[PDB]
Design an enzyme around this catalytic site. Structure first.
Site, PDB file in Angstrom:
ATOM      1  N   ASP A   1      54.677  45.129  37.880  1.00 37.03           N
ATOM      2  CA  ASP A   1      55.511  44.510  36.853  1.00 37.03           C
ATOM      3  C   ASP A   1      55.292  43.003  36.772  1.00 37.03           C
ATOM      4  OD1 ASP A   1      58.052  46.544  35.873  1.00 37.03           O
ATOM      5  OD2 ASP A   1      56.893  47.132  37.644  1.00 37.03           O
TER       6      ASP A   1
ATOM      7  N   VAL B   1      36.929  40.174  45.089  1.00 37.50           N
ATOM      8  CA  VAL B   1      36.765  40.881  46.349  1.00 37.50           C
ATOM      9  C   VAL B   1      35.354  40.627  46.854  1.00 37.50           C
ATOM     10  CG1 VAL B   1      38.513  42.615  45.548  1.00 37.50           C
ATOM     11  CG2 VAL B   1      35.946  43.126  45.427  1.00 37.50           C
TER      12      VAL B   1
ATOM     13  N   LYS C   1      40.143  41.826  49.362  1.00 34.04           N
ATOM     14  CA  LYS C   1      40.647  41.628  48.003  1.00 34.04           C
ATOM     15  C   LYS C   1      41.646  40.480  48.018  1.00 34.04           C
ATOM     16  CE  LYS C   1      41.800  43.801  43.723  1.00 34.04           C
ATOM     17  NZ  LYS C   1      41.010  44.813  42.948  1.00 34.04           N
TER      18      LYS C   1
ATOM     19  N   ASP D   1      45.549  53.526  37.056  1.00 33.55           N
ATOM     20  CA  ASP D   1      44.406  52.684  36.724  1.00 33.55           C
ATOM     21  C   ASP D   1      43.089  53.366  37.080  1.00 33.55           C
ATOM     22  OD1 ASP D   1      42.849  50.584  35.906  1.00 33.55           O
ATOM     23  OD2 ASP D   1      43.805  49.078  37.206  1.00 33.55           O
TER      24      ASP D   1
ATOM     25  N   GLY E   1      37.901  41.130  38.849  1.00 35.26           N
ATOM     26  CA  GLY E   1      38.544  41.823  37.755  1.00 35.26           C
ATOM     27  C   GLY E   1      40.045  41.870  37.951  1.00 35.26           C
TER      28      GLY E   1
HETATM   29  N1  LIG Z   1      36.042  48.507  48.851  1.00 34.36           N
HETATM   30  C1  LIG Z   1      35.100  48.076  48.008  1.00 34.36           C
HETATM   31  N2  LIG Z   1      33.807  48.158  48.389  1.00 34.36           N
HETATM   32  C2  LIG Z   1      32.859  47.730  47.550  1.00 34.36           C
HETATM   33  N3  LIG Z   1      32.995  47.206  46.330  1.00 34.36           N
HETATM   34  C3  LIG Z   1      34.293  47.138  45.977  1.00 34.36           C
HETATM   35  C4  LIG Z   1      35.370  47.542  46.739  1.00 34.36           C
HETATM   36  N4  LIG Z   1      36.556  47.319  46.047  1.00 34.36           N
HETATM   37  C5  LIG Z   1      36.166  46.799  44.914  1.00 34.36           C
HETATM   38  N5  LIG Z   1      34.802  46.657  44.797  1.00 34.36           N
HETATM   39  C6  LIG Z   1      34.064  46.115  43.669  1.00 34.36           C
HETATM   40  O1  LIG Z   1      34.798  45.041  43.128  1.00 34.36           O
HETATM   41  C7  LIG Z   1      34.490  44.907  41.724  1.00 34.36           C
HETATM   42  C8  LIG Z   1      35.756  44.624  40.958  1.00 34.36           C
HETATM   43  O2  LIG Z   1      36.846  45.222  41.675  1.00 34.36           O
HETATM   44  P1  LIG Z   1      38.312  45.186  41.096  1.00 34.36           P
HETATM   45  O3  LIG Z   1      39.107  43.988  41.629  1.00 34.36           O
HETATM   46  O4  LIG Z   1      38.914  46.501  41.393  1.00 34.36           O
HETATM   47  O5  LIG Z   1      38.138  44.942  39.539  1.00 34.36           O
HETATM   48  P2  LIG Z   1      38.174  46.117  38.513  1.00 34.36           P
HETATM   49  O6  LIG Z   1      37.956  47.441  39.171  1.00 34.36           O
HETATM   50  O7  LIG Z   1      37.047  45.920  37.462  1.00 34.36           O
HETATM   51  N6  LIG Z   1      39.662  46.091  37.738  1.00 34.36           N
HETATM   52  P3  LIG Z   1      40.902  46.593  38.774  1.00 34.36           P
HETATM   53  O8  LIG Z   1      40.357  47.654  39.815  1.00 34.36           O
HETATM   54  O9  LIG Z   1      42.037  47.278  37.918  1.00 34.36           O
HETATM   55  O10 LIG Z   1      41.451  45.406  39.503  1.00 34.36           O
HETATM   56  C9  LIG Z   1      33.743  46.176  41.304  1.00 34.36           C
HETATM   57  O11 LIG Z   1      32.392  45.877  40.970  1.00 34.36           O
HETATM   58  C10 LIG Z   1      33.860  47.102  42.523  1.00 34.36           C
HETATM   59  O12 LIG Z   1      32.656  47.832  42.728  1.00 34.36           O
HETATM   60 MG   LIG Z   2      38.805  48.557  41.945  1.00 36.40          MG
END
Ligand SMILES: Nc1ncnc2c1ncn2[C@@H]1O[C@H](COP(=O)(O)OP(=O)(O)NP(=O)(O)O)[C@@H](O)[C@H]1O
Ligand SMILES: [Mg+2]
Ligand SMILES: Nc1ncnc2c1ncn2[C@@H]1O[C@H](COP(=O)(O)OP(=O)(O)NP(=O)(O)O)[C@@H](O)[C@H]1O
Ligand SMILES: [Mg+2]
Lengths: 311, 277
Positions: free
Chosen positions: A178, A43, A58, A151, A38
């Site tokens: 930014d 990640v 990530k 966010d 996302g």
């Molecule tokens: N530390 C973590 N442990 C487990 N799952 C994680 C972790 N960090 C992120 N995720 C998972 O990663 C997925 C997407 O993460 P993420 O990159 O944050 O996208 P997003 O939340 O949808 N948009 P954004 O957070 O603004 O970048 C989700 O399904 C989270 O549950």
């Molecule tokens: Mg997240």
């Protein structure tokens, strides 16, 4: 800061486990499976080889001029100072292949968005506890480093089988915001009505985001546009009309038959359009719903692991 | 197109160093003896309807020649691989040019540069070609001379993802309200309502940049920009917030007009720019 001792001893355990793993580079790690993607990033669950620990990495992919790339990495290293029982354990940040990687705690149960799709709805008993966790994280963040989150949404609330709740992906770096984070628009919107019209916003915008998130998790559906009358008993729109709804229509509210006044009122106060009149965090911390849920007795870990199937 | 079907005599043209990527292929510098810019595209679609429209637009660009429009020279298509060859522009982008400390714009120079751009767009419109991507980074300034690049290019359907969107801020500043209302994940750029009126709105944004040497909306979350642009609110507030001169601001209010039909033609805009200080 009302730092419990239980809390300070798992904070101590992971800061001293932090120097045991030492420093960092790509081939120290090895894949496991797909956690997700996302906002320009993916990640993955990872194993670090020097230290048997399983972490979450990530990666986001940014070819741009290197000067701002290093400004980003140095602004992001402040994550090392950010440590609370309600903010994900951060370990390291590095540049590799023009792909910034952040190494953080692995959270057994993933995001409350993930939790939600399998769970369908989230009970009120429990949303009390997540609400307390979020206000604590946001106050910790505003007081200690003078930042705001920018966010807040269910996919950024993370849960583990040990029963903790913490927030991930808060806006630590200005340059990364930014230069990359701003340009994305998804299919839903959690942005306050005063951010959408481009005024100066504050942590008030985060109160709004949290309120909308609590509605979504409480009723199982992204709350705007409000469900239709028959759709409510059972329990196709472009992005601009969503934003125009958020700015020009009444806010969501919880259904009056199902949840207590204290919950309905908590969310109603989070969702006031004028940020001056929206509750701040001092006021939300002493709200009736909070005093109730903080003093209650819920075993969170049990609900979580019987919700998703862990141990 | 095997490149020998074009009126520029060509024996051989050589690729040089690259000079930027983007949604539409990679742009190299090259030698036709003259320097040229070569844009490399690849066609995912592989459906011959896309290549039919590509052929249509590329032979339409052949019919153009004007001192304010970059010279279209050639295009070859060995599908999926395609290449578009235009004349190379020495000098600086108008974008980086207004943003220079040392640069000295004034009430005259701005009108002159603007009139150059207006002549170019007026030609393009007369032959019925819509730019669909007029912006400060697609105008080149070398000493006295001003040249428009990268026109017609949004009409094609090659490889560019997810079902979310990623929208640069600089771009959205140049987009008229008709367009940003239609943006939504899973919608391609080709389905958006570009037009002659949207082109004059984008000219409104480049004129504002000539006045203020910056964006009219400070960098912010793209959802915010979408609402402010498509509501018309953001542009009314910018016209409020810091003003320029009355006759100057009249052209801006005309070009940014919320209802597209009330936007002026480019021929009229020439006159408006004439009756100035
Ligand atoms: N530390 C973590 N442990 C487990 N799952 C994680 C972790 N960090 C992120 N995720 C998972 O990663 C997925 C997407 O993460 P993420 O990159 O944050 O996208 P997003 O939340 O949808 N948009 P954004 O957070 O603004 O970048 C989700 O399904 C989270 O549950
Ligand atoms: Mg997240
Ligand atoms: N005729 C030309 N002469 C000189 N430079 C050119 C010419 N045409 C394109 N360029 C350069 O090509 C580079 C990339 O252009 P382009 O691929 O259109 O990306 P962009 O305009 O920055 N945004 P996008 O249109 O989405 O790719 C820029 O550095 C332009 O200045
Ligand atoms: Mg371009």
């Amino acid at each position: 800061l009302e730092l419990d001792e239980q809390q300070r001893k798992r904070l101590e355990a992971f800061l001293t486990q932090k120097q045991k793993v030492g420093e960092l580079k790509d081939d120290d790690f090895e894949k496991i499976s797909e956690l997700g993607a996302g906002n320009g990033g993916v990640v993955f669950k990872v194993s670090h080889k020097p230290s048997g620990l399983v972490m979450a990495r990530k990666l986001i992919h940014l070819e741009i001029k290197p000067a701002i790339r290093n400004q980003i990495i140095r602004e992001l290293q402040v994550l090392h100072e950010c440590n609370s029982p309600y903010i994900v354990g951060f370990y390291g940040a590095f540049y590799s292949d023009g792909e910034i990687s952040i190494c953080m705690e692995h959270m057994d149960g993933g995001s409350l968005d993930q939790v939600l799709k399998k769970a369908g709805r989230i009970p009120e008993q429990i949303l009390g506890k997540v609400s307390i966790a979020v206000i604590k994280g946001l106050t910790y963040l505003r007081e200690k480093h003078k930042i705001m989150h920018r966010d807040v949404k269910p996919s950024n609330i993370l849960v583990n089988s040990r029963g903790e709740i913490k927030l991930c992906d808060f806006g630590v770096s200005g340059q990364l915001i930014d230069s990359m984070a701003n340009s994305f628009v998804g299919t839903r919107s959690y942005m306050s009505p005063e951010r959408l019209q481009g005024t100066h916003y504050s942590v008030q915008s985060d109160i709004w985001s949290m309120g909308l998130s609590l509605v979504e998790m409480a009723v199982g559906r992204y709350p705007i546009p409000p469900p239709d009358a028959k759709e409510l008993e059972l329990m196709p729109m472009a992005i601009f009309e969503l934003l125009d709804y958020i700015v020009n229509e009444p806010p969501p509210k919880l259904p009056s038959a199902v949840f207590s006044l204290e919950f309905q009122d908590f969310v109603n106060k989070c969702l006031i359009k004028n940020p001056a009149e929206r509750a701040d965090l001092k006021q939300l911390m002493v709200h009736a719903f909070i005093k109730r849920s903080d003093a209650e007795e819920v075993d969170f870990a049990g609900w979580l692991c019987s919700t998703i199937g862990l141990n | 197109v095997y490149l020998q079907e074009w009126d520029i005599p060509f024996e051989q043209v050589e690729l040089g160093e690259p000079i930027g990527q983007g949604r539409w292929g990679r742009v190299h510098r090259g030698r036709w003896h003259g320097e040229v810019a070569i844009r490399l595209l690849e066609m995912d679609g592989h459906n011959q309807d896309h290549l039919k429209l590509f052929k249509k637009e590329v032979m339409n660009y052949r019919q153009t020649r004007h001192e304010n429009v970059v010279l279209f020279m050639g295009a070859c298509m060995n599908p999926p691989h395609l290449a578009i060859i235009t004349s190379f522009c020495k000098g600086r982008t108008l974008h980086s040019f207004v943003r220079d400390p040392k640069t000295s714009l004034d009430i005259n120079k701005t009108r002159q540069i603007a009139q150059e751009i207006i002549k170019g767009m007026g030609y393009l419109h007369a032959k019925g070609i819509v730019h669909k991507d007029l912006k400060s980074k697609n105008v080149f300034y070398d000493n006295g001379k001003v040249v428009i690049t990268d026109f017609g290019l949004f009409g094609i359907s090659g490889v560019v993802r997810e079902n979310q969107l990623k929208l640069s801020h600089d771009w959205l500043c140049y987009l008229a309200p008709e367009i940003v209302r239609e943006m939504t994940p899973g919608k391609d750029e080709d389905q958006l309502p570009f037009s002659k009126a949207a082109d004059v709105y984008a000219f409104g944004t480049v004129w504002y940049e000539l006045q203020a040497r910056d964006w009219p909306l400070k960098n912010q979350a793209a959802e915010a920009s979408i609402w402010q642009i498509g509501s018309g609110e953001g542009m009314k507030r910018v016209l409020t917030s810091v003003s320029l001169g009355k006759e100057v601001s009249e052209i801006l209010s005309a070009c940014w007009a919320f209802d597209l039909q009330e936007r002026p033609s480019f021929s009229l805009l020439m006159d408006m720019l004439e009756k100035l200080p």
